[PDB]
Amino acid sequence: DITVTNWAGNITYTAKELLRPHSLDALRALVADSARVRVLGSGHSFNEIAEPGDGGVLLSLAGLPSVVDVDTAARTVRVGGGVRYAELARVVHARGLALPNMASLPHISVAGSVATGTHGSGVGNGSLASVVREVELVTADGSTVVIARGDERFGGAVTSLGALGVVTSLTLDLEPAYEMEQHVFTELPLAGLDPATFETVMAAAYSVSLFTDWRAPGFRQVWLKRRTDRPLDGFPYAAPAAEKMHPVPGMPAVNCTEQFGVPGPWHERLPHFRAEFTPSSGAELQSEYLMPREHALAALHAMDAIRETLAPVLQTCEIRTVAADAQWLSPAYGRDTVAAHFTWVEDTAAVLPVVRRLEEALVPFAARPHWGKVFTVPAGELRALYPRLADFGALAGALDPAGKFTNAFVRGVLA
Ligand SMILES: *Cc1cc2c(cc1C)nc1c(=O)[nH]c(=O)nc-1n2C[C@H](O)[C@H](O)[C@H](O)COP(=O)(O)OP(=O)(O)OC[C@H]1O[C@@H](n2cnc3c(N)ncnc32)[C@H](O)[C@@H]1O
Ligand SMILES: OC[C@@H](O)[C@@H](O)[C@H](O)[C@@H](O)CO
Ligand SMILES: [Cl-]
């Protein structure tokens, strides 16, 4: 017996072994011979999404080769589902190519990241799932099904909560390698941050994040990640940082990607954390809520008005933008989006009442929770938030009629 947990350690899985097949032949046979299956990627979810239930099989792709195969003429890369972004990015950069975005920390599986709606920031930048052009699935009976952009099912095939089968490979679209500079600023007030000024701030560079502790009024930090092949206007709205910064006040800035406007390659500037920073776990919980971009300032004012409730259990809050997603279950489905992320203290009993209060404040803004993070939004409210959820339920019924890949988390959503 071994104990398998998620990365933060707040979720302990029921599985007494983590199965790690060493060939596709073994993987197909294992899937075909198991009654219920969920896949474990890198465990950077915070809820029971990967839990297969008692007697369910928890399987990993860590025992298969981590393939990264770039076609330079086509500007595409075929990558194993268990490959993490840090390796993917190093490889494609060495071939002269690049991705349009990355999440805050690169040591996360590509298949697991796209499964839940993972994104970075920037008003013109889609989710990480949006560059995927093809997925290859091992389905419930062990057979392989390939689904590509243009297929009428493709909208449900990438961000699928792992509910269609085991993604063994994915193919992503790439662009030429590009250089970036990161400029940090401190103390951006919320007072006077009107709709025009908010839009200007969030569009001031290729990717922009705001950070706050919800203590003193306003925002503690603003991070501008600029492409050197694009203009950068003066940024008058907050003071330039005097020191290297960490998004969480009091944590080690050495861990973070280079600042002070020093040019470097895309994959060493899009993440907030440098590749050398390799935590095996973290003492944190996370939540994030994704809303129509037009509700940004109203939502920020709702949070400000309850900030004394948020602050005591908060490490940092990060505000980002995401372009509309074509994936039916993406929290960014169908609409340009503002995202409000919370990295909490790891105290489940103190955090849940605060999450409930936060969700109540955000209800009129059609807030969709990040599938990989902590939320308490009831299932019926969830279904009402996704116009194409029925299309998804139909696709899952077609590819997995016995619900082999549906666990209690997925079942609750679809019910
Ligand atoms: C821990 C963490 C999380 C995180 C982050 C930084 C850290 C330190 N930064 C993020 C960010 O900047 N933006 C964002 O949107 N999310 C961010 N996160 C969250 C994280 O990216 C997601 O929670 C992600 O889904 C985690 O992926 P991971 O692979 O680590 O997680 P998992 O629990 O094991 O799996 C999640 C789901 O995906 C399914 N899965 C995984 N592999 C497969 C394959 N090969 N086939 C089918 N399904 C797969 C799992 O079953 C589960 O449903
Ligand atoms: O979506 C996760 C979020 O991006 C998180 O990684 C913060 O950036 C981090 O906790 C700040 O330290
Ligand atoms: Cl203010």
From Swiss-Prot:
Species per Swiss-Prot/TrEMBL record: Streptomyces coelicolor (strain ATCC BAA-471 / A3(2) / M145)
FAD-binding PCMH-type domain mapped to chain residues: 11-177
Catalytic activity: an alditol + O2 = an aldose + H2O2; xylitol + O2 = D-xylose + H2O2; D-sorbitol + O2 = D-glucose + H2O2
Subunit structure: Monomer.
This protein's UniProt keywords: FAD, Flavoprotein, Oxidoreductase
Cofactor(s) needed: FAD
Catalytic class of the enzyme: oxidoreductase
Binding site for D-sorbitol: S104, E318, R320, T343, K373
Family: Belongs to the oxygen-dependent FAD-linked oxidoreductase family.
UniProt entry tagged with the keyword Ion transport: no
EC number: 1.1.3.41
Gene designation: xyoA
Modified residues (Pros-8alpha-FAD histidine): H44
Details of cofactor binding: Binds 1 FAD covalently per subunit.
Tree of life domain: Bacteria
GO molecular function: D-arabinono-1,4-lactone oxidase activity; FAD binding; L-gulono-1,4-lactone dehydrogenase activity; xylitol oxidase activity
Residues that bind FAD: 39-45, 104, 109, 112, 116-119, 167, 320, 370
Name of protein: Alditol oxidase
